[PDB]
Amino acid sequence: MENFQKVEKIGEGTYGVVYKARNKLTGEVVALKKIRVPSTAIREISLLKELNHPNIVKLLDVIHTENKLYLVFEFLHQDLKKFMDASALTGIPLPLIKSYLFQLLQGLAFCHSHRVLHRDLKPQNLLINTEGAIKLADFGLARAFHEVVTLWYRAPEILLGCKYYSTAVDIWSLGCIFAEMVTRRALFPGDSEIDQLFRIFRTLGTPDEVVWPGVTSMPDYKPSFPKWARQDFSKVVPPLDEDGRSLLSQMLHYDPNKRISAKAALAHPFFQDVTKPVPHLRL
Ligand SMILES: O=C(Nc1c[nH]nc1C(=O)Nc1ccc(F)cc1)c1ccccc1
């Protein structure tokens, strides 16, 4: 778009290319996403301009022109997936893991309180700066509307065909990102929907009417599912301490109504000692 110079490709979202760009007039460096225009998307997108929070990538402008769609976001210099790969040897220090988790829960508590879900959290859409900050990106783009879209962070109620699912889905994804930071291995690396479901089952137990009332009446649930026993958390995320493990377990509750909200998670004793360390990033 005329007011922008593409400096470089910085990714491919679900929804079209993402460019680093410079505003020919303002000077500002920005993230420019080209989508791919029904008035429904126009409307939802416009709502997002308003939901501002220090832990949500700022949506600067929504250009709808020549009947094409661009979103202009504030620019961050790295994503969490790259940072994680970069920190493979040593792992991310716990106090930095805890800060990141804490800030993301703040962003989610904000979104959820305005009834906006993300619905597709993944380390690739979590963006970080040199000053210790981490921000949710791509917020709202999913209601509004190639490699495999990853299933690794998908809540099981989504996998079981629930069509009217809740903010608890973001809580689930965030718990899977939490474990992956601690262990340096993805929690549930599914390569199909059944494989994804069965990986969850194998770690957490096949859910039943005891732990998830109503589970058996779900669209894609079958009685013929195997019955695996639940594994112990101490085996799942060493060397996370007992507070971190308690929290994670609550974020990974099967029953979306049992699953901890972002707001009550902020109160958990794991965060009693939270700080804001600054990462070392080599841009
Ligand atoms: O809004 C998105 N990204 C961004 C917004 N502001 N900065 C970015 C961004 O990707 N920055 C970035 C990330 C990794 C790099 F190596 C260098 C720079 C987005 C859109 C679709 C899918 C994923 C992320």
Side-chain angles (χ1 to χ4, degrees), residues 137-194:
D138 257 25
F139 224 108
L141 269 65
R143 183 183 56 164
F145 322 107
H146 293 107
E147 284 186 355
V148 152
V149 183
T150 181
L151 282 35
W152 294 3
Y153 310 94
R154 195 168 294 170
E157 59 266 35
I158 294 175
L159 271 4
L160 285 176
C162 187
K163 52 282 285 193
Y164 298 106
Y165 48 74
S166 78
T167 53
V169 310
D170 292 330
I171 293 294
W172 179 277
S173 304
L174 184 46
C176 289
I177 306 181
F178 180 20
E180 194 179 332
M181 285 194 283
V182 170
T183 72
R184 324 177 224 165
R185 214 172 154 152
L187 189 53
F188 306 126
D191 60 356
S192 64
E193 286 202 72
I194 203 57

Side-chain angles (χ1 to χ4, degrees), residues 10 13 18 31 33 57 73-79 82 124-125 127 137-138:
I10 67 180
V18 186
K33 184 186 191 185
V57 194
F73 290 111
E74 71 170 295
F75 186 72
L76 284 84
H77 285 83
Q78 183 170 167
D79 67 74
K82 309 206 194 334
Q124 297 76 16
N125 62 37
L127 301 183
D138 257 25

Side-chain angles (χ1 to χ4, degrees), residues 2 5 19 34 43 55 125 131 138 143 146 211 255:
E2 307 72 58
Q5 38 200 312
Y19 292 104
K34 301 155 182 276
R43 247 72 70 102
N55 301 107
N125 62 37
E131 300 183 275
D138 257 25
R143 183 183 56 164
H146 293 107
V211 309
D255 187 348

Side-chain angles (χ1 to χ4, degrees), residues 5 9 26 29-30 32 57 60 67 93 108 126 135-136 153 156 158 171-172 192 198 208 233 253 268:
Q5 38 200 312
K9 193 177 310 175
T26 80
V29 331
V30 104
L32 218 258
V57 194
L60 281 24
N67 289 67
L108 290 190
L126 266 20
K135 293 193 195 201
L136 291 138
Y153 310 94
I158 294 175
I171 293 294
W172 179 277
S192 64
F198 284 179
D208 54 30
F233 267 57
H253 275 152
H268 188 281

